[PDB]
Amino acid sequence: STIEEQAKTFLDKFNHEAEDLFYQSSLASWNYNTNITEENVQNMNNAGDKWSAFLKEQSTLAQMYPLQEIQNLTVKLQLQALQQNGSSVLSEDKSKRLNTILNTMSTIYSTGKVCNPDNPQECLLLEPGLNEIMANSLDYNERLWAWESWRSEVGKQLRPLYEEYVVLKNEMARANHYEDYGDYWRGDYEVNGVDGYDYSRGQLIEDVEHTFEEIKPLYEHLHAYVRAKLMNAYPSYISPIGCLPAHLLGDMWGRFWTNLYSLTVPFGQKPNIDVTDAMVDQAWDAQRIFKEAEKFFVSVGLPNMTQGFWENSMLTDPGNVQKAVCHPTAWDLGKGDFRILMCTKVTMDDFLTAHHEMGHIQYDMAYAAQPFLLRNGANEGFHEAVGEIMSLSAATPKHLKSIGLLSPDFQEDNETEINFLLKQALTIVGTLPFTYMLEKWRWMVFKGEIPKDQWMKKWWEMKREIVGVVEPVPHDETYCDPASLFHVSNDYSFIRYYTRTLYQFQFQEALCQAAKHEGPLHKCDISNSTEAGQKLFNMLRLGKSEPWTLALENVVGAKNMNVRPLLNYFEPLFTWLKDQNKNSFVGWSTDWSP
């Protein structure tokens, strides 16, 4: 009757009871998302409160168990995830202050308004109408003024509560035997106590810096090409030695540049692939979309699953008979029950999101044999990365010709592939250095090393020199615009997106070099190749039971990370850029001032 058997039965009973509570809460949340009612709100609110009290009780009861007296890696890992501190040293006043700070900075930013001029009635909200006039607009002055008006009423109210949140989270990290809030955030990105595969939290910082200095010249070259296109798009607005304007990147912060594509068309004579009208003349629907996704997945090698799931997921427009959202979302409810939720329309992006959802749910049901605490990915970014690679790999026209989505009369040329790679760079590698500098600024902020009052131009100046974007108007100390974004306002990290990009690139390279494919890396197919399917499935079943380095090793063969997937995937586009826009000025200079 050693302590290991008591830990085993405690873990089992916690897994069962938490599985029941999680199943009830997820079921209530799902049927509330399909049918919005206040009684359902009370239902999963009571369920979530009871589950939170239960997890606190299980953690406190597991605090008795010695974490150094377990030799099995699985039981040690599950006790480590169960013996977390959370509120080990936390005053109740400090806890409610933290909660009120979180709620206030969420509610103020979420309910932000740009209603300065004219009558105070015509107020455009941030989500529906602001991004239209920041991204799909022509007036430089309107974009500048709207961005300034958005930052002005947000930064001053968002700065000191965010700084107090930084201070209190630093105090909690110190009280929880950690360095800082980033160190608590780097704890998941840490492989220690494992022989052979050893990783440090600062090794993640080193990897971030290494990947950024590896991707610096290609990003400089694409910035040069974008500025060269903007010279023709905007006559006499951007100096050649100057950097890009802040509001010219589509988004207010500069997240995605897919909106900045009509000005950056390489060739109007090359048609991209399009099966949406081919879908229309084929007259396919939501169930046909799901059947095509399943056909693609069994072409990869993943087996079919439950027939009661398809009727359990409502896919078309819910209508006004019951209030329901239209965001495509997955539901891993627990013990053998999954749902998807969207309103399906006839768009190609609906097919992309459906493939993304099926990749998510396939990875969900992969680790069903693992316990409820281990019923996740290796870390947070892995799930989004593995959804994204199934999302992108479905846009291969040879698959569409094999399944009849694309007619065989259409053909793929070099220039169309170059345009597709340029769009992919606008989506994938365009957001990579922005995610890098956001992650770096957030890490210096949450580490509590840089002064709070040194931010007169600091975020401005390494926006100018690190990514080559200059603000059009200076801002004072009360502004916290890099801290004013959606993810920082609700404390959603950005290391997850960087690691997702890295993992999806390495996984894409591994599957393209593994599934008997030779040639250009953006012409990568995985149909009629089950070796890649079983190589994936070897890592699908692992779940959270193993360190992430072991998960990468068992599916790639390497123990580290390299940017060679990015070079392999973007090599034709890199060569086309190198003989296209090398003649213009390449890079950026920080000497330009407003």
UniProtKB/Swiss-Prot annotation:
Side Extracellular, residues: 1-594
Tissue expression summary: Expressed in endothelial cells from small and large arteries, and in arterial smooth muscle cells (at protein level). Expressed in enterocytes of the small intestine, Leydig cells and Sertoli cells (at protein level). Expressed in the renal proximal tubule and the small intestine (at protein level). Expressed in heart, kidney, testis, and gastrointestinal system (at protein level). In lung, expressed at low levels in some alveolar type 2 cells, the expression seems to be individual-specific (at protein level). Expressed in nasal epithelial cells (at protein level).
Annotated consequence of substituting N15D: Increases slightly the interaction with RBD domain of SARS-CoV-2 spike protein
Biotechnology remark: An engeneered stable, dimeric and secreted receptor with combined mutations that increase the affinity for human coronavirus SARS-CoV-2 spike protein shows potent SARS-CoV and SARS-CoV-2 neutralization in vitro.
Positions contributing to chloride binding: R151, W459, K463
Keywords, ordered alphabetically: Carboxypeptidase, Cell membrane, Cell projection, Chloride, Cytoplasm, Disulfide bond, Glycoprotein, Host cell receptor for virus entry, Host-virus interaction, Hydrolase, Isopeptide bond, Membrane, Metal-binding, Metalloprotease, Phosphoprotein, Protease, Receptor, Secreted, Signal, Transmembrane, Transmembrane helix, Ubl conjugation, Zinc
GO biological process: angiotensin maturation; angiotensin-mediated drinking behavior; blood vessel diameter maintenance; entry receptor-mediated virion attachment to host cell; maternal process involved in female pregnancy; membrane fusion; negative regulation of ERK1 and ERK2 cascade; negative regulation of smooth muscle cell proliferation
Effect seen on changing R339A: Strongly inhibits interaction with SARS-CoV spike glycoprotein
Activation/inhibition comment: Regulated by chloride and fluoride, but not bromide. Chloride increases angiotensin I and decreases angiotensin II cleavage. Inhibited by MLN-4760, cFP_Leu, and EDTA, but not by the ACE inhibitors lisinopril, captopril and enalaprilat. Highly potent and selective in vitro ACE2 inhibitors were identified.
Reactions accelerated catalytically: angiotensin II + H2O = angiotensin-(1-7) + L-phenylalanine; angiotensin I + H2O = angiotensin-(1-9) + L-leucine; bradykinin(1-8) + H2O = bradykinin(1-7) + L-phenylalanine; neurotensin + H2O = neurotensin-(1-12) + L-leucine
Cofactor, how bound (note): Binds 1 zinc ion per subunit.
Mutagenesis / variant outcome for changing W51V: Increases slightly the interaction with RBD domain of SARS-CoV-2 spike protein
Membrane-protein topology: Single-pass type I membrane protein
Outcome reported for the amino acid change (mutating L73P): Increases slightly the interaction with RBD domain of SARS-CoV-2 spike protein
Effect of mutating E19A: No effect on interaction with SARS-CoV spike glycoprotein
Known outcome of mutating E57K: Increases slightly the interaction with RBD domain of SARS-CoV-2 spike protein
Function: Essential counter-regulatory carboxypeptidase of the renin-angiotensin hormone system that is a critical regulator of blood volume, systemic vascular resistance, and thus cardiovascular homeostasis. Converts angiotensin I to angiotensin 1-9, a nine-amino acid peptide with anti-hypertrophic effects in cardiomyocytes, and angiotensin II to angiotensin 1-7, which then acts as a beneficial vasodilator and anti-proliferation agent, counterbalancing the actions of the vasoconstrictor angiotensin II.
Entry's free-text remark on domains: The extracellular region of the ACE2 enzyme is composed of two domains. The first is a zinc metallopeptidase domain (residues 19-611). The second domain is located at the C-terminus (residues 612-740) and is 48% identical to human collectrin.
Protein name: Angiotensin-converting enzyme 2
Organism: Homo sapiens (Human)
Included stretch of the parent chain: 19 to 612 of 805
